[PDB]
Amino acid sequence: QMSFTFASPTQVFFNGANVRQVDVPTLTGAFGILAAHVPTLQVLRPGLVVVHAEDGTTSKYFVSSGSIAVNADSSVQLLAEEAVTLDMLDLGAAKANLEKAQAELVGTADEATRAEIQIRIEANEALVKALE
Amino acid sequence: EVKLGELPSWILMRDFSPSGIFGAFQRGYYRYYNKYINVKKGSISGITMVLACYVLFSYSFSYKHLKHERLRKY
Amino acid sequence: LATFWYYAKVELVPPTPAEIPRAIQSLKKIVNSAQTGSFKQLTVKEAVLNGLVATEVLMWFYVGEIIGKRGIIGYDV
Amino acid sequence: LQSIIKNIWIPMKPYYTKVYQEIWIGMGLMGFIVYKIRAAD
Amino acid sequence: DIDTAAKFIGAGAATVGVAGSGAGIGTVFGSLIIGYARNPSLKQQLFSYAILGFALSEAMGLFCLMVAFLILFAM
Amino acid sequence: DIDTAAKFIGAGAATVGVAGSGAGIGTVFGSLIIGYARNPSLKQQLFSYAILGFALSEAMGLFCLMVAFLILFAM
Amino acid sequence: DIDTAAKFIGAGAATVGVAGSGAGIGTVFGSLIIGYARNPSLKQQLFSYAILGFALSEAMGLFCLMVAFLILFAM
Amino acid sequence: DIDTAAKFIGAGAATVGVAGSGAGIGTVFGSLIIGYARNPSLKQQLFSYAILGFALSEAMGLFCLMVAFLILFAM
Amino acid sequence: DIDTAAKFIGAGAATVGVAGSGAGIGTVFGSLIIGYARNPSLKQQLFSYAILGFALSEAMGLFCLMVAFLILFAM
Amino acid sequence: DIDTAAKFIGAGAATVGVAGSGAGIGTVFGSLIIGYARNPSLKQQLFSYAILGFALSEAMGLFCLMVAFLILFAM
Amino acid sequence: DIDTAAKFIGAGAATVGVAGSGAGIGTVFGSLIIGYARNPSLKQQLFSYAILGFALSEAMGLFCLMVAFLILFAM
Amino acid sequence: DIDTAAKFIGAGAATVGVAGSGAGIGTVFGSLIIGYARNPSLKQQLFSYAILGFALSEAMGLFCLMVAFLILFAM
Amino acid sequence: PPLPEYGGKVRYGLIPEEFFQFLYPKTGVTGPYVLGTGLILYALSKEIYVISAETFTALSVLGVMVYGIKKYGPFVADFADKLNEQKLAQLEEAK
Amino acid sequence: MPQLNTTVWPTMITPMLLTLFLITQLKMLNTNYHLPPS
Amino acid sequence: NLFASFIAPTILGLPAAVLIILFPPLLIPTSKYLINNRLITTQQWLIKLTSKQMMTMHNTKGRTWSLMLVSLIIFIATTNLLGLLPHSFTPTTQLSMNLAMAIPLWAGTVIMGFRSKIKNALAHFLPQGTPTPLIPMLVIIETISLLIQPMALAVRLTANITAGHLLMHLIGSATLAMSTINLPSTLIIFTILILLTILEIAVALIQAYVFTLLVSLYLHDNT
Amino acid sequence: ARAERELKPARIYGLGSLALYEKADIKGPEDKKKHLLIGVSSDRGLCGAIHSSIAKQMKSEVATLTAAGKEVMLVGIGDKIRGILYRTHSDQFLVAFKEVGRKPPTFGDASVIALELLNSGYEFDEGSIIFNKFRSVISYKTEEKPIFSLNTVASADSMSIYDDIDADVLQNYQEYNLANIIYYSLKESTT
Amino acid sequence: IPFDQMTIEDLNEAFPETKLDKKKYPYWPHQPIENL
Amino acid sequence: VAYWRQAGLSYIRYSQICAKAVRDALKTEFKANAEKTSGSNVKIV
Amino acid sequence: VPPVQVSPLIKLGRYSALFLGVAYGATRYNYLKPRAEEERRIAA
């Protein structure tokens, strides 16, 4: 019943597909969407996205940001700015960038650049935790 | 072993020492374990029998309290 | 279901009036062994076997007792 | 005194000497409490 | 006699303890209502959990009832 | 007599136990309100559940009432 | 006399049971607040349900009150 | 005398019933906080509703108080 | 004397009623915590309201305390 | 005797304290419903926590029961 | 004597009132858990409010305890 | 004697006060469920707060228990 | 040393086939069964096995155990076997 | 309450200490989990 | 009469409680083999799962208690399960054994937290962001909480197992008294008894796990 | 050429972005004054009737909006449209852009344009984007998509059925959809 | 030796990598819990 | 209201930072191509 | 499995002891009934 549409500016992972459950890391917490879910629209934060197909297999991607919209007709549109499959990433670079961002944080003093640093820190933390 | 012998001097022939009874109990434990538990494709009966003997041993010492709830009087 | 009776007709049957001689023969054999004291040759395996069939007939006496008092759990009175 | 201290005390040494030390102090406390209880009964 | 009297009193007292099971079932189903209104595709599994919760909550309440009878009839 | 007296006392005590049903219905309805405000298209299915919850919650409370009568009239 | 005495005691006891209706009101009129804050369009549709819930919740509480009078005046 | 004694006892018992109003006011003034934190532009209607809820919740509690006086002074 | 005795009993009973104010403050703040975690820029109204709720909730509880003294000292 | 009498009374009183465990299990198994309805892929980790909460909540209630027996049988 | 007797009774009664603080502290932390799960960045600010709420909630409960001692030792 | 009798009565009464800890622990372990279902990546920090809340909530309840013993054994 | 591939052939999970095959020559096939029923009748008749609440708790726990076995016996058995075969395959692949 | 019969308390304390701290821990120490091969 | 199942069992005058307490470990055989029978396979799998679930949260100092805690969670569990057998004596129903399991463990944990870590150990008596006018009370609170913890442990185990067993026994007695009266009512009460037995199996496992988890959380708090 | 290949996923993505405003049926407010007008073109000439069509549509819309008294501001994505419109429309102008057309447009460009449109201090109550919807190698059509502000989506009645919605989530979603629609226009105007 | 009659010690003899580091982790399970 | 919104950022900036952080954590086999397909060339005037 | 005919001595012992048990049960029933009712009456 659920028509799923997972997309990126350059790639279409799903299009009108019929899956059973999609977990998303909304900025207001994580939640899972199945058929007939209550209509909502949300914006994402860096995190995993697990798509469960009817056959019982799970496809795990990682999205940096974007939007999710589940509609009255059980039609889900998930548009991610940078959606990468998990195998395209590495743990060492994530940990190193996390350390660099933490160092810049303890070094920085201005509010806006501190917020930018903290955002990068959160992205890298979600990275290292999603990888392993 | 017993089930083969028919002599009462066998009773005195056994080792009725702490090490002797310890070894007899260990031998029985290993015989049971190797016939019923220590086999691949084993069953649950190898444990249910021990649990049954345990329930029996429990009812044993519980009889002294359970004989006061007798239905009849004779 | 029915195989129980299929076996009972063989082994759960009142003894026929023709086979009591063989029974008293087994009894006289056992009492002879008791007289001579030759039961010591009986290895304890068969001795336990005989004790178990003895407890069997004793259980038969007790089920007769409970059917004779018209009560299962002790004496109703 | 053989195969006892070979199978009972050899493996348990690193735990009985360094790990469970405060456990032994607590055991002393528990024994003292149980003795004080069984005393005033 | 004062014995039967206090038996009645303690029976009523132990009976008071069913308010907990009452309030418990309220939350178990109220939250079931909310959870179904959120993700209706999981109605069956939620209803399962619901029963489980209820089956425990009222259980505790029933316990009190036994004590009541344990005081009123067993004593 | 002390018997009728303690009957009255235990009756009031057992009657106390209806507070649980009161609170239970309150939460069940409160949560029905919330759930309908979230997914009004599920109003009917939710309302059904609501009744069910209520039908159990107050039920427990009613139980206490029986004990009250069980003490006040049946004894 | 001990009869009137225990009548007073049981009356107070049965009166205790109104706490359930009190807490019921809080949840209903609290969940009504939340539900209206979420979908103010259905303001009227919800307020209806609210009353219904209240009309039942306090009802149960009122029941206790009857028992109180049933003990204090009817007996 | 035992009459005044049980009057005091029943008065305290009936006074117990204010816990319901306490918890009730609590949920309402809490859910009001949440609802305002959600849709602050709706503070007017919510606060109104809040009072209404409170005005009923504590009301039930006050009822118990009357019974207390109804036992302590009117009797 | 039985009079002072039942005064003590009724005082303790009326004192029981503070549990409602306790649970009230709990939600009044619990929900304040949640509401601030949602919309922190509105801490002003979220807190003001909090106090208001508290100022009423515990108030009801305090009422019980008066009855306690009203029984223990005023009588 | 008055001793056994007050033993019965105190036993019922201590038994009252199970309402807390009742309401506790309801919240634990209800919030479990909600949390599963939100993130069903965490059903396992949530159910675990649920049990833990329950295993503590009812525990406290059981404590009261001991006191009951501690008054009714141990004394 | 009946005086010490009713002192014990009123002490237990006044002790009952700690259930409110129990439920109160519980909600203050349950809501702290939720609020932190929402906006973990404010963890420090949230914890502060939590303590404040707790510091008041249990406070009310403690009050009851004083009355208990005020009846058991001061009288 | 009436002294031991009222000791039993007050012990049961003080034991009643554990319902608050029961309901409290349930809230901390229910809101923990919800908060984990919302932001599972904080499982560790949330479970910490949970314990803290529990460690206080039941604490208050345990206080009542002391009074019980303080009446039953220390007196 | 390798392990034998089967156990001891217990009947009803309580009695091994050794007892039945040993009683078979003298009293046939229904001999052990009539021994069991005679013993149980004499036990619950001479008040050896008194009947109380423990009897019904025993019936309940025995029913729960038998249902649990008959339901989740194949699962745990083949799960242990799957663990062993997985370890064995992983080992042989490392050879 | 038999739990309060403080006469038979050491009979419960001693074998528990012998079982929980010596026997069971020795049976655990024999349960070893080797590292996986290459 | 009613508590005849919690009295220290004696057979022929000997304190048979010793054998009942020593028996549980006899159900956990061990083997030096690499591939062994089904029993040891499943039991090693269960011990692995339990160790992973319990010890993961701890640092390098806490994990040294692994052998302890796992052993604990095994012993209790087995005992509790063995308690559900008919006519059995459950040694966890005794306050003695639970106290002797709780006071040593919690006491050693607080002691190891006080020997080292003494500054933070005394600091844990106060949460981080506590305001000033409330500093004193929230110390007296935490002291009594820390002092009641071992009691709470032992009683939470005892009270639970004892009540479970007593209640199963009482419902069994009800079934007995309903045998000669309405048979459908007998079947209903028997079904209630079966559901209660399942609940009691669950509560046995859960109480074992909760005792273990609370001791482990104290250890983590002092390591 | 390659743009016809990179359009299919981009078309799917942009239409999936807009599918919400299509399903919930947001109608936009017809009573407000502040209007933003983005036109998409390139920096290169010799396109034919592309920049002319964009400029004609922008001029006609500016005329019909100012006739109703609505203060319009213009944004030109591409130097061609800014050059064509700067003389006759200079007062009505907020931001322009360059370096479009030489390289295929990417989401980074759309994000930059969205940034500079938000960091401009011009709270537009409504907006519209005008591009050249590509139909076939011979046929294109100057199309125009709407762009709603926060208050439009928030105050819409049909938006009540959507869940966990507050001003913050709607703000973030609005910004992301602005970027998405700019990207969609950029990928359509390069064909 | 086939792997069904092999002792953990014989396995450690055949693959010295499978041996547990009784020096870095002297206490059970002689290895970090995550790799368990 | 997240922290960066209090700081004055916008979800476009948040998304840019997050996408950049995910692109940097890419293995060098994909990093150059991914940075190419998502690089910005537009310039404000 | 083919049945086995039990030795005649065991069958004769079985049925004999069975009949003796019926007789003994009847005799002890009739013997205990009077004293049973007498003690039941004398208890009150």
Side-chain angles (χ1 to χ4, degrees), chain D:
Chain D
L1 275 297
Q2 169 62 297
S3 315
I4 295 98
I5 316 304
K6 178 214 186 311
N7 281 354
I8 308 312
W9 201 85
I10 285 176
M12 300 302 310
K13 181 185 197 166
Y15 311 95
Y16 280 178
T17 76
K18 306 171 231 182
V19 194
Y20 300 162
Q21 196 193 352
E22 309 90 346
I23 294 307
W24 310 134
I25 311 297
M27 271 196 194
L29 162 65
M30 174 268 304
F32 157 61
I33 288 188
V34 163
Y35 283 160
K36 251 194 177 182
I37 281 186
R38 295 185 77 242
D41 298 328

Side-chain angles (χ1 to χ4, degrees), chain M residues 7 11-12 19 24 30 32 37 39 42 45 53 56 63-64 73 76-77 85:
Chain M
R11 298 186 68 88
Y12 318 111
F19 188 70
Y24 170 79
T30 200
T37 178
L39 213 50
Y42 157 77
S45 157
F56 285 120
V64 161
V76 292
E85 71 80 20

Side-chain angles (χ1 to χ4, degrees), chain B residues 13-55:
Chain B
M13 196 182 183
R14 307 303 104 176
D15 188 6
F16 66 111
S17 315
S19 170
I21 50 185
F22 170 78
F25 275 146
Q26 193 173 352
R27 272 174 282 140
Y29 173 75
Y30 275 109
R31 197 187 308 195
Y32 178 84
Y33 174 67
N34 293 309
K35 188 169 172 289
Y36 291 102
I37 309 183
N38 195 14
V39 303
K40 70 205 311 299
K41 314 279 182 184
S43 178
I44 199 56
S45 65
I47 297 283
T48 309
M49 266 197 302
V50 189
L51 262 66
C53 167
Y54 175 72
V55 167

Side-chain angles (χ1 to χ4, degrees), chain P residues 56-69:
Chain P
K56 178 45 172 287
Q57 190 65 270
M58 276 187 77
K59 289 184 218 173
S60 164
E61 287 309 87
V62 162
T64 189
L65 271 298
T66 58

